[PDB]
Design a protein around this ligand. Structure first.
Ligand code: MTQ
Ligand code: MTQ
Ligand code: CS
Ligand code: CS
Ligand code: CS
Ligand code: CS
Lengths: 388, 388
């Protein structure tokens, strides 16, 4: 034991004051819209924070370890020294919380849960060890779907403490396939944006699962548990699922839906507020677009006339570099930043929507995708510009 | 030379007479709706047929070969005997033509091209050698993105002859990443539904690229050409791209869009016609749903009231087996068949839409996704039931 998960909030780390706080305990927060999109790589200070419990505190860093157990030949135990000695990779990858844009779905028909605007999302450079390498180390070769021992899934278990698990830890799981395929870039990350991982973001070690919803990138690892069936954790089985609009608290059956992993094409306008005063002339419409599953953004469309007509915005990743969608130069796990300059002379509704590399679209209206958990609001984002 | 590509249509193979023919020369055809969905595995007789030119004819089977050239150490030449001696795989995979459902898009605003109804799609068991294995044979190891010789793409060149290429061959390409990853199941297929591959479908050898539009699964292979940049073939650069609705023949710039590979969530009702007479009582609404990229179908929704309310249809792959979406038992490259029994007492509009494992949705209206080439019509399919 080099680390503990507190059961109360007295030793929480400090955060940037500019953060819009959606829940204090546990800590759930997001940057102001106008700062989200200022840079392609999200500074740690401004990277959104989503926690189900108190933040773990490390008393003694050497003596911290991740335990490799379950359907494995030799249940080893891996120290932070051991993880840093594996071949290091740097993966650029956006974490988007499945809760992103929930508040606007709630406004239409109420949802229980923490409120989020348009910034429950962040892009960072993750440094660490590939999970496939770590599993090779324990007798599970690369590109394996299942083993002779019955292994099919990999469960990541935290050291934190959540009310929902009655004081137990946050957990998630992924398939052995995904875990064991180095091209899927699942990372045991000990670094974020070139610095040592912070407390808020999972120090000393988190999993990062690219192209998958935020909720699966488990922070503050206690164990990596190789198992026969998917994790039966509360947050795999009784959350983070996409129900149809007909489903409510009286008819919900949690086993009727599969756990959400991949996520669909998303965009939002960030350079202006949902209802914003402007001076006549040129206004810069800037924002983000992403899709899960390693799919890029082929197109961002912007409309000034209630969606009769669209004009195409520009798209960019690393600044200077030209963005190309299904391409070896592109950062396939990361968002894409969009900009369009428009001419305003009158009170104007502006709308943004994105289309990904697989030609997937965003739903026109929240109503068609409205869901009980208030997740994956990918409605066309509509903003209103007014003449002040 | 054991095979040739004709320049004229005098030696075309026979087809099933039930086929609805959309163009005779070259041969472009699709089964009647009502037969499409009778079985999970589409019989070869009824599997849709899409050709840009005359069908190649083989005069001498031994002496046919595929040539491995380009950015490769030892330009080998591989005979059909050699391909069959590699480890055989059987992959279940749906080919959907990017042109599927084009005619309905054209009704709204005219598109140039061959007309298709709802059946430019088919599901089969493909037998052959993995392309990753074949490339390993020529010194390119598995899970490579690029090589020291500058290789980044793999181009498949046919032996056929197309007007568009001025008598030259149909070609496509994929990334070295996709080609070389055995989990992507790219196959050099010599078998289809347990029999030897037909002429129509590429005898003796075609590529099948799962989870990617039909157009990339190049038939009647002449050469597998490892190269530094994407193929400059006509059908990669000047076709099979997804343009926004504002693009027309006066403003089109082909380099403005990337070549379409993955495709989005699609469904159609097949057990009844777009306008159909029924007797009061119980009517079975049966169809297909698919998505590209190895994504499953999480949900199919059916509405009888103009899309105010939806009820969930059932979903099935292999009969008897229970379909589960992101699961080891599921056929991730294959379509999903849906059925719902409904009660009709009155004249009724029925609507079907699907939602994939990544929670991607279908666009409500063609207008929003209308495009010049008339590809990837994934509009909600609406049918009209009348009281006769
Ligand atoms: N140990 C641990 N405890 C958590 O509550 C926990 N929650 C997260 C969810 S649920 Mo969601 O609501 O799909 S977004 C999200 C991210 C947030 O990463 P970060 O704080 O570092 O921005 O951490 C995931 N990882 C976790 N790990
Ligand atoms: N050699 C060759 N010539 C073709 O014209 C050719 N066209 C195809 C397209 S273009 Mo599309 O417009 O996206 S659907 C489709 C499929 C059809 O395979 P099959 O006919 O056996 O169903 O083969 C692709 N492979 C090809 N291979
Ligand atoms: Cs431990
Ligand atoms: Cs890159
Ligand atoms: Cs050849
Ligand atoms: Cs399977």
């Amino acid at each position: 034991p080099g680390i503990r998960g507190p059961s109360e909030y007295s030793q929480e780390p400090p955060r940037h004051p500019s953060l819009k706080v959606n829940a204090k305990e546990p800590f759930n927060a997001e940057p102001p819209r106008s700062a989200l999109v200022s840079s392609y790589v999200t500074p740690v200070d401004l990277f959104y924070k989503r926690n189900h419990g108190p933040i773990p505190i490390v008393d003694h860093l050497q003596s911290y370890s991740v335990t490799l157990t379950g359907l494995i030949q030799n249940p080893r135990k891996l120290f932070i020294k051991d993880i840093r000695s594996l071949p290091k990779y740097n993966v650029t990858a956006t974490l988007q919380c499945a809760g992103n844009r929930r508040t606007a779905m709630s406004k239409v028909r109420n949802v229980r849960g923490v409120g989020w605007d348009v910034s429950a999302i962040g892009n960072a450079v993750w440094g660490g060890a590939k999970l496939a390498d770590v599993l090779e180390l324990v007798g599970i070769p690369k590109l394996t779907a299942s083993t002779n021992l019955g292994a099919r899934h990999v469960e990541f278990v935290s050291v934190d403490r959540c009310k929902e698990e009655n004081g137990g830890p946050y957990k998630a799981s992924i398939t052995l396939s995904q875990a064991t395929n180095p091209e899927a870039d699942v990372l045991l990350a000990y670094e974020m944006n070139g610095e040592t991982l912070n407390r808020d973001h999972g120090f000393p070690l988190r999993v990062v699962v690219p192209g998958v919803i935020g909720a699966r990138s488990v922070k503050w690892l206690d164990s990596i548990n190789v198992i026969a069936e998917e994790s039966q954790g509360f947050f795999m089985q009784k959350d983070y699922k996409m129900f149809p609009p007909s489903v409510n608290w009286d008819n919900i059956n949690w086993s009727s839906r599969r756990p959400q992993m991949d996520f669909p094409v998303q965009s939002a306008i960030c350079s202006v507020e949902d209802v914003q005063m402007v001076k006549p002339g040129k206004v810069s419409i800037k924002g983000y677009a992403v899709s899960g599953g390693g799919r890029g953004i082929e197109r961002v469309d912007i409309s000034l006339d209630g969606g009769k007509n669209w004009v195409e915005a520009s798209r960019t990743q690393e600044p200077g570099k030209q963005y190309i969608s299904e391409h070896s130069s592109s950062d396939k796990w990361a968002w894409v930043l969009f900009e369009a300059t428009i001419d305003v002379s009158q009170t104007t509704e502006v709308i943004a929507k994105a289309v990904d590399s697989a030609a997937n679209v965003q739903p026109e209206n929240v109503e068609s995708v409205w869901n009980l958990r208030g997740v994956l609001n990918t409605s066309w984002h509509r903003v209103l510009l007014r003449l002040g």
